[PDB]
Amino acid sequence: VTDPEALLLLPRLSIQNANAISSPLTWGFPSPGAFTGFVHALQRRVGISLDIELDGVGIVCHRFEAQISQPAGKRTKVFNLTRNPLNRDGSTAAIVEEGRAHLEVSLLLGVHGDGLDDHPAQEIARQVQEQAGAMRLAGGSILPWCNERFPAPNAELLMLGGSDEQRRKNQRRLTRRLLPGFALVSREALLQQHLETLRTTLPEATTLDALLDLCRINFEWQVRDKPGWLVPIPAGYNALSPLYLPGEVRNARDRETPLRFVENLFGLGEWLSPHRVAALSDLLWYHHAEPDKGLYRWSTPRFV
Amino acid sequence: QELRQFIESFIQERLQGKLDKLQPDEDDKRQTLLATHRREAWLADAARRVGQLQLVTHTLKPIHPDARGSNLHSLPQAPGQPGLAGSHELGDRLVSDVVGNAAALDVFKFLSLQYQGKNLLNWLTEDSAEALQALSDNAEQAREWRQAFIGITTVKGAPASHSLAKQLYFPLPGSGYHLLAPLFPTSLVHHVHALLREARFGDAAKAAREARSRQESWPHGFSEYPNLAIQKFGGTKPQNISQLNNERRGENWLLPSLPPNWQRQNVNAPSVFEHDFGRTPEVSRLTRTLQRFLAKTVHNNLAIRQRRAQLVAQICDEALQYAARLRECQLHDAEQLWLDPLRAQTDETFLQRRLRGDWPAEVGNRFANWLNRAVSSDSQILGSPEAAQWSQELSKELTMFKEILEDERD
Amino acid sequence: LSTASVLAFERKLDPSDALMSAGAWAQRDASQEWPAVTVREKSVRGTISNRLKTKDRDPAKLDASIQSPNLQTVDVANLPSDADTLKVRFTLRVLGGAGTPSACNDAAYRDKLLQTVATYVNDQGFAELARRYAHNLANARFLWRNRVGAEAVEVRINHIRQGEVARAWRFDALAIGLRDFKADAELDALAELIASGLSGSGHVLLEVVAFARIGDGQEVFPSQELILDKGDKKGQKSKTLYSVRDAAAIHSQKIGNALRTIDTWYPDEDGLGPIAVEPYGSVTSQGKAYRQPKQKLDFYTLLDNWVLRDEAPAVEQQHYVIANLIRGGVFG
Amino acid sequence: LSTASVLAFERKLDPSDALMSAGAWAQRDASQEWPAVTVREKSVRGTISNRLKTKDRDPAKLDASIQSPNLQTVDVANLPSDADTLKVRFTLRVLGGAGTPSACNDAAYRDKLLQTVATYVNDQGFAELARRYAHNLANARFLWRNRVGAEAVEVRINHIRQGEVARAWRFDALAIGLRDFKADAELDALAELIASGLSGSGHVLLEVVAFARIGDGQEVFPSQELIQKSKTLYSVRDAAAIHSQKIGNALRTIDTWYPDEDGLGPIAVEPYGSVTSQGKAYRQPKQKLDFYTLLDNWVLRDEAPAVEQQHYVIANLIRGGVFGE
Amino acid sequence: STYIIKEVQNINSDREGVKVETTSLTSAKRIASKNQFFHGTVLRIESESGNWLAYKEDGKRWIE
Amino acid sequence: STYIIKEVQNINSDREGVKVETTSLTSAKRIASKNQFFHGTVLRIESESGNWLAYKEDGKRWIE
DNA sequence: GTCTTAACTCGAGCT
DNA sequence: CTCGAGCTGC
DNA sequence: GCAGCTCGAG
DNA sequence: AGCTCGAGTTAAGAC
């Protein structure tokens, strides 16, 4: 949870044919882990060359267009699959589940590397955008910005220097271009509060998430109210088996790190407009892992 | 000594089913294979044919029919330090099924009786007097078969992932990474799906929906799950897929996880006398939600002072989104200063004299007036500080709104 | 030195969806604001005219089957009332580092593969593959049915750098052979640029714009969207056209499949023309799969032999193997 | 050499939607900017006109029904108050390569089919089919009910090459026989152009515009869309039109070689000679004239049927469809 | 049990059907297969009302 | 629950009604029917506000 | 050991 | 056929 | 205040 | 009422 010195803002990154499932029990915007690992991989290639550190990733969803068709029998939607090529045996292919959608997102990269001062911020931003374009986010291609209109540059702002007046003016300037989309943040406080609140009824955790994320109706009539948009998210992966050396796990794509069988862990996230947040750094998602216990979560602790 | 009332009963209950298709030519070679089998041999097939299948709760197959991997049944882990909630909070109701050959599935139904009338799942690994006194089978066979009945609940004896296992990398704090090979949570999936079976089209839930339709109030609560998504995983055939999936419809329901802008609208706001009107489903729903709390008493001074404050924050933010999607005439003129039309740089003074230090901040008062025309001006709370404190809430919210407005282009 | 159980290659030359619009050929050069083509619904009434299963001895039964026609609601896309030119716009990127494997179990295998790739590049460059791709881009092979029955097809490729400046080229699909690849200065330049991008220059962006003359009110053929779930009730659409931003388009993969149609070295080579670069030389439309595994031309066999046994296959086979590696997939 | 389980032929002679408008017959020479015919809704009452079950038919049952009438909403399109001429505009293209299969499982079958087609073309050209198609284009058969009860119908078929009008044609549907095909210089020229286009000698684009005199405020019969509301008309861009398939069906009314020789006359080229209105399908499979049997014999067994049957088979291949198994 | 047997090119279509009045669904399925006038049609069994009971593709098994 | 029971010649009209204050709609429907003062009037049940809850023609059943 | 098709038995409608 | 709920008489 | 009775929907 | 058909279900050859 290190304090980020500066923040790099990718203005707009479009994606086509991304991964829309992102979870066994949910579907929609990709898991935040995908973005954290994305920033990590960027640091993995450019971070060493430029000697910079990237740990914080901010998420602003500008546009979401799925590939779904609503059936006439029920109100539950279905996804639009693709056609697999013919098998070698010549028989028809087997249909497999997949998802695709168009996601236009803007990312905020927290720069913790001290080397930023040694290079121009604008040049660093341009170099990062160039690598970002060739990278593939969420499982689909990242379409660069090419159209009739002028391109959108990347703006880097230093948050260490300047008076509170200048800091607030700069933060306001950033929010002006990030207004069309809504940000994503994890709220586990309300979840635990409700767990203790409803503990008397039954000690069920999944039941509370299900009940909170639905249109609840009480007998009187009225519909239960929620303070903001609340949705389940894949908070992380809990360890399901003990660690095994890289040799023990067959078909591992890498022998450098050991493999561990994990499961899915949920949480409760909230979509909040950028203007509500005062400090952007608290918005950035930071991945924290424990070697002993298999709990790995991307929740942003600084938001609270 | 009632175990025999389950083993010798279930098998006898089973043999009687093996008689529906059994002729005098089959009743001979099946008499000792069923009748005497109910005693010792019907289980002999199991302990000999239990290694064929494997009871588990998290499997790899769901991600591809061709893939092969290692299925796991054991889940004692539960490291949820803050509200976190998943497969690690079941404890009981762990409904588990088997993975392997499709030839033998009732063999597992016999093992499935490990809770059918007693704590036999605890006796499936202990309580030998249950099998050595009631079942009266030898410890060299019975408890040895009990091991093969426990071996069915552990790995085959080797760990392995696959090239389609959907692995990932994963970073660590200042050190090198570790990679996970996640799997499918069948047990939690089935728990959720039973919940959904019970609530979506239950009996009591359907009755509550009927009560909502008839506008009749009774002591029951019902909820609606919308915008579910269907995943036809495991292929067209239930066989070659998780047995629990085969027992169920074979389609896994996914709860919606879209952002508030999933179902976008066709931007058309060039109605011009209707500047603050701007009515859409979210807007009118927020207005109805406010007016529904406007019909409350001050007995909830705090409760109605936050939900309604947060609600008006939502409203002003939605107006900001309106303005934004617009950016990308008199009634729209002051709005032309709030809703800056195109960031017009063409006009010399109309864009640098009528907009440079001319952010018509009266638009906030226009919107306050539209709201007062939306939420009724009921003086019931205007006499006391209820509606006056509501006005103060509105005032400070619109003040922050104007503070954010001042710097559209300045 | 065994093979790697896990092999994957990120696809290269990955295009995006192809947007469509309509307009006048006269304004095509000067106007790029053409309005998009909106999907529409239509009804069709049918008389069963397929083959027969029952004995063809039933006259009155057949008459009754006629009197019971078929009805279905479909989706079609037609140009505006006054529009004779079709426009398709899709971007294309060249990532590079094709030979670079995304994931490999063994390091030795990965190094050996890279060495073989370097040897191939030194002996001969990807100029052949780049030129073939150049032909596909120049002609309208990516278009499937819109090209058929066209007066003039004009393709314009612009290499989008950070800024608008680009080495814009212009070709003619009709003049260029569909089943024959010929060399040209512009084609060679484009192939060189593609080869550089593939080698890993760092960034490549190509904006492709096509203009096809069909006719007023003609019917375009976008990619039908699959569902896999029919439905439990009546009154549905038996044909759904893919549309994004309330505009019809073609799937990215369907375009990327046509662009990589360079496998002309198949064993039969008896009447068949260009074929899609796929493992096992599979073809969906024809329903047959050339290059079965028993022979040695199979991708898996060729790669395993050329890596482990160091058996250099024919130059043609080497090109095919590199093309497959570019397409990507799962091996081992 | 068995047949191919998968056979498909892309349709040739594929027209577009047919838009409609109104105007004055005098201004016929210049017909542009004419306002389109907009569909409208009108309340309409009904009554008991259908067949009653003589058992269910009772004195008081009728008084009840007629005292409880079935209302209904329908859509009709009528010309303006003062308008006597209907206009229809639809384009037509000639692709060619009729015999060329789009998809075939076996290569041998495709080659055999192409060889038979080449032999047929060499022996005799498509002039017969083109000449027959020319009659349908010249006459107003594409129109279904608008033609009935018309004073004067004038069709104008232009030729568009590189955006210019290569050659125009003006005919009279009434003068040309509907059930009889007569030779004419203009018809022959049009047939030649169509034959060339099908053979693949060059692009062919035809803009067809018809003007029929019906009467002031008359009611046109556009193509009814699939189904309170009984009748729903197909409107494109707030204008009435006729379906593409409905026009391509009429343009192919070239089957007159049936084994009955009844007075019905031209029949649309459809496998099994099916007719919806008449409700009977000529050329049943028991006889040897069926398309499937003819093609199987003439390809696999090399049995050349009569020249007429060959024409019918070529028409079927032009129409396209799904064959095999 | 009155079941309406229909045949269509595509699974999604509307066409009249004969009333079999068979005892059980299995009967209707076998009846439709035994009495089929086309190869590419999709047998669809439906009750007297508008609810679809089951459908069967030419190359696939019965599905509900 | 305040429900306004009205009688009118045509479904579209504005005539005052008595406030029943019944628990559920079924009660209001039975009360409206038992209290109908005319044959050809069209019963229209509405809440305290101007929102139309349901209507019933003379020779037709309740609709929502 | 494994999954597949061809085989078994099974049930319901014509003549 | 059986099933709710407002009014009036004790 | 209370409860038998009527009426009209399912 | 024999026989036909197809649905449901079985188990052994081959990978």
Numbering used by the authors:
A (entry chain B): 3 to 222, 239 to 322
B (entry chain A): 3, 12 to 280, 285 to 342, 353 to 434
C (entry chain H): 25 to 356
D (entry chain G): 25 to 251, 260 to 357
E (entry chain J), F (entry chain I): 3 to 66
Task: Tell me, in the authors' exact words, what the paper reports.
While target dsDNA (i.e., protospacer and PAM) binding is inhibited at sub-stoichiometric concentrations of AcrIF9 to Csy, dsDNA binding is unexpectedly restored at higher stoichiometric ratios of AcrIF9. EMSAs performed with non-target dsDNA (i.e., no protospacer) exhibited similar results. To discern how interactions between AcrIF9 and Csy trigger binding to non-sequence-specific dsDNA, we next determined the structure of the Csy–AcrIF9 complex bound to dsDNA at a nominal resolution of ~4.2 Å. The reconstruction reveals two stretches of non-contiguous helical density that are not accounted for by Csy or AcrIF9 but are consistent with the size and shape of B-form DNA. The model reveals that both dsDNA segments are interacting with a positive patch on AcrIF9. Additionally, the dsDNA segment bound nearest Cas7.6f, interacts with residues from the Cas8f N-terminal hook. Notably, the positive patch on AcrIF9 is composed of five conserved residues (K31, R32, K36, K58, and R63). The two Csy–AcrIF9 models are nearly identical and align with an all-atom r.m.s.d. of 3.7 Å. We suggest that Acr-triggered interactions with non-sequence-specific dsDNA could represent an additional layer of immune suppression by sequestering the surveillance system through non-productive associations with dsDNA.
Here we set out to determine the mechanism of immune system suppression by the previously identified, but mechanistically uncharacterized, anti-CRISPR protein IF9 (AcrIF9) that specifically inhibits the type I-F immune system in Pseudomonas aeruginosa. We show that AcrIF9 inhibits the crRNA-guided surveillance complex (Csy) by sterically blocking the hybridization of target DNA to the crRNA guide. In order to determine the mechanism of immune suppression by AcrIF9, we co-expressed and purified the Csy with AcrIF9 and determined the structure using cryo-electron microscopy (cryo-EM) at a nominal resolution of ~3.9Å. Overall, the complex maintains the previously described seahorse-shape, comprising a hexameric Cas7f “backbone” that is capped on one end by the Cas6f “head”, while the other end is capped by a heterodimeric Cas8f and Cas5f “tail”. AcrIF9 is a 7.9 kDa protein made up of a five stranded, anti-parallel beta sheet cradling an alpha helix, a fold distinct from AcrIF1.
